Design a protein around this ligand. Structure first.
Ligand SMILES: Nc1ncnc2c1ncn2[C@@H]1O[C@H](COP(=O)(O)OP(=O)(O)OP(O)(O)=S)[C@@H](O)[C@H]1O
Ligand SMILES: Nc1ncnc2c1ncn2[C@@H]1O[C@H](COP(=O)(O)OP(=O)(O)OP(O)(O)=S)[C@@H](O)[C@H]1O
Lengths: 367, 293, 74, 74, 146, 73
């Protein structure tokens, strides 16, 4: 009874406070829930919650989850995007200073920009297919995600899957529970500010199943552009539209992807790199990064026959990470030799002076 | 003076809350948030989480779940340096004490420490190696982890992944559950105080790969030579940085490791021992210990 | 008459406890019973989804599942 | 005062409207058990699982397994 | 057949469920209220006449629990479908004005009792002259004007 | 025979069964289990005394999984 009386005292002070400080924030959300962006049904569900019970200090389990749902509903972006790209030659000016090679993916991006610009009818602005990148480990996939997002000058966020076996990370849990937990998509859309970002879905090969099924049914619900215009959540109760979001998915093989996902797909096979391609990326991208971190800038230099020795005799892969570490070993051996007595100018590494720096050649050269 | 009266009434509130618990260790939490430097998105997220947690007390259980969230989030280390002591003759003599032979790995640690002197202030990326040691079972590999971590005056922690088919050991359960808890790895960073530790992932070639129970594909976000600046566990909703971490993993056979994990890691093979090597190891490491015991 | 009067004082609580209220409820799907269909058995199950639903007007962990089932059933 | 009073006025309305039925699914399951059959050990097994569903709540995932067990028994 | 008979057309086919309990609905005892798939196609139409096509019925959704036979036998037989019941419906539902369409590629994975009602409609293929006529009449204007 | 005895008729079409778990149940300790074909037939008949036709009991796929012929015993 004493506690009930003193809680009366506390909440009396509070309602003078909700006069004094407690005006102009929930009032400010009632402004901002009626500001620009919100659809009409979202305005009705915003008018649903206006009968408040005013006990926000002594608790309250029915006061804080409604505020949480209001904040989540008002912080997702409603009808805002940075403008479209105008020059598609400038797209080639941007996509070519990140990767040597990869003709097909750059062509598909230019094609999608040309189709989105030139269409003034219908049937393709709504239906634009989803890229599925498939390749051996080591070729560029995620760096392509960054390069595509900077090419169109759109925002970017990257969802990694593979450790996810529960469905309520793609969908979420019901908002009446204790922890208010919407899925990864509502996080990925409140990270970016625009309603039209680029989302990279890493490793759709590895969504394992369990009891209460797999979240691949939610993946069907999100990766088919004929029902995600009315995409609702278990947490949110409004229909959100994941239509214009340009999804890019990576994979290593197509079997473990579910057959309800191979209907709204578009595969692109990255076959691997070759020796001239590896040598070009080796110079123009791998060597100054592998020397700039190692502090040996302008004290050591590798030739072009020496990169060919490193490729042909110190790595067997379809990718470029083994080449990256094999160059990094040269940078560290030079950084160790520098402390044992310096030299002048810069020592140059011909193709014959490699095994001082890299030991025994493992793979025999093809003669 | 009126705000003095008003927040003084809130002083009386937390006097009845726990004698505490309304602005006492809530404001200690504001101190430890504006202590050791978090990134600004993570900092403002923790501030709005503290703002949604502040004005309640003693019920609901969501107050308890958010209190454990701000106890995990403000105690995992953010910008807690380990001083790189850059002597390469001292550390050579310290590594020579615990093991005999092992020329390759000791040369590697001397290389990867001789590089760290010549850091030209900024403009370097400062990325720690990711080693995998491959060898027969008797050859000393798990012994070498604490030796390497002691020679560099760093910290040390073990994680045995010996027979885990249990996913969400690597990542966590998301925090809306009842007994919610982070993964093994964020706890391993929590127990250590610094952000430069030496984590020993023990048996990485012995895990599970199945349509239910595949933890080996959850090791993609961790053993990541570029993109582990964005590590996403399920308990913490923030990207945590795992670039500075000197990972050392051990295995027994390359034939059972998944193909998106061999290329993430750097192979160093240990070729058993020979009779001269075994005889020297015997004389000055094995026979004195077995005589003492 | 007794129906009218009991629902009088129930919606008197609605305009009385006027946030917002009532869910203004269960005066209102009364018209889509005979409009949308229905045979007698659906009416027997869903008229036993009026007033024992009316038992409270908060939440619920029951009102959502019964909401989906009943608004599926109507 | 008005809150505590007027929600009791709500339950006043409901206890007159609903009345007296005892209509749910649980004692309906008990009645469906006690109508047809049964052999004795089967009956005692069903009554044990029925009480195991009775005195507790509704929503746990083992209760769904026991519910499907009893529904396959009936 | 829908537009000739002035009917609607809905797809919804095998491969989207885990068992025949998910072909049916689920009771309100759960929290996740999974409706019967069928009824959800009936919801989007305000007509109880039209066809329902069963695309790739040979590409089943079976498991160690449950084959897709019983929930299919109680909707394909012209006898028990007149009073149909799901766990998410629990009322007498009527299937006598609908005319179902079933699509398959191989009859070999179809069980024996469900072949009591099937009537075999096979496909001859397409000539390159037939494919040239199709690609002039029917594929070039869509893919160009799109 | 069902009309001459004035009882219920039902048909179980065997030959497609592959393990003992489609004749008996599985266990309650596996998620979503059900009993076997005979319990389905007893569910779909209404009385204790129907007749049950058993087409192709001679073609049951006893294999590496199990042997439902022993389950039929
Ligand atoms: N043609 C290229 N030009 C420039 N950098 C490249 C090229 N190919 C690969 N890389 C780099 O090589 C690294 C490989 O990046 P990732 O795409 O993540 O490799 P990955 O093969 O996708 O790994 P997973 O396991 O398949 S996700 C990145 O540093 C890329 O920037
Ligand atoms: N060169 C060495 N010099 C000194 N002690 C050594 C040497 N090699 C091995 N040992 C000792 O031999 C023992 C081997 O222990 P571990 O390192 O656990 O072997 P291990 O190979 O790691 O076991 P597994 O099967 O690989 S997990 C330890 O007591 C080491 O100290």
């Amino acid at each position: 009874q004493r506690e009930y009386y003193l809680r009366e005292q506390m909440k009396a002070i509070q309602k003078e406070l909700g006069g004094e400080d407690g005006l102009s924030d929930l009032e400010a959300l009632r402004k901002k829930i009626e500001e620009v962006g919100m659809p009409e049904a979202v305005k009705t569900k915003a008018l649903k919650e206006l009968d408040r019970l005013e006990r926000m200090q002594q608790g309250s389990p029915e006061a804080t989850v409604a505020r949480t749902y209001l904040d989540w509903l008002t912080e997702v972006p409603w009808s805002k995007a940075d403008p479209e790209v105008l020059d598609i030659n400038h797209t080639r000016q941007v996509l070519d200073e990140d990767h040597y090679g990869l003709k097909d993916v750059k062509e598909r991006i230019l094609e999608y920009l040309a189709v989105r610009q030139l269409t003034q009818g219908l049937d393709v602005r709504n239906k634009a297919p989803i890229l599925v990148l498939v390749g051996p480990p080591g070729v560029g996939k995620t760096s392509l995600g960054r390069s595509i997002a900077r090419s169109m000058n759109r925002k970017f966020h990257r969802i990694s899957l593979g450790g996810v076996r529960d469905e309520a990370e793609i969908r979420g849990h019901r908002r009446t529970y204790i922890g208010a937990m919407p899925g990864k998509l509502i996080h990925a859309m409140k990270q970016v500010g625009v309603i039209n970002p680029v989302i990279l879905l890493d490793e759709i090969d590895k969504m394992s199943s369990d009891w209460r099924g797999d979240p691949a049914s939610a993946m069907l619900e999100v990766l088919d552009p004929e029902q995600n215009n009315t995409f609702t959540d278990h947490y949110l109760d409004v229909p959100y539209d994941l239509s214009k979001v340009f999804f890019i998915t990576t994979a290593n093989t197509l079997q473990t992807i579910p057959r309800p996902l191979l209907d709204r797909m578009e595969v692109i096979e990255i076959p691997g790199y070759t020796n001239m391609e590896k040598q070009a990326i080796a110079r123009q991208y791998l060597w100054p990064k592998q020397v700039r971190e190692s502090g040996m800038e302008g004290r050591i230099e590798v030739t072009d026959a020496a990169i060919l020795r490193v490729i042909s005799e110190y790595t067997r892969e379809a990718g470029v990470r083994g080449l990256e570490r094999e160059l990094g070993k040269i940078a560290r051996k030079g950084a160790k030799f520098w402390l044992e007595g310096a030299w002048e100018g810069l020592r140059t590494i011909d193709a014959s002076d490699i095994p001082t720096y890299l030991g025994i050649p493992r793979y025999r050269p093809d003669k």
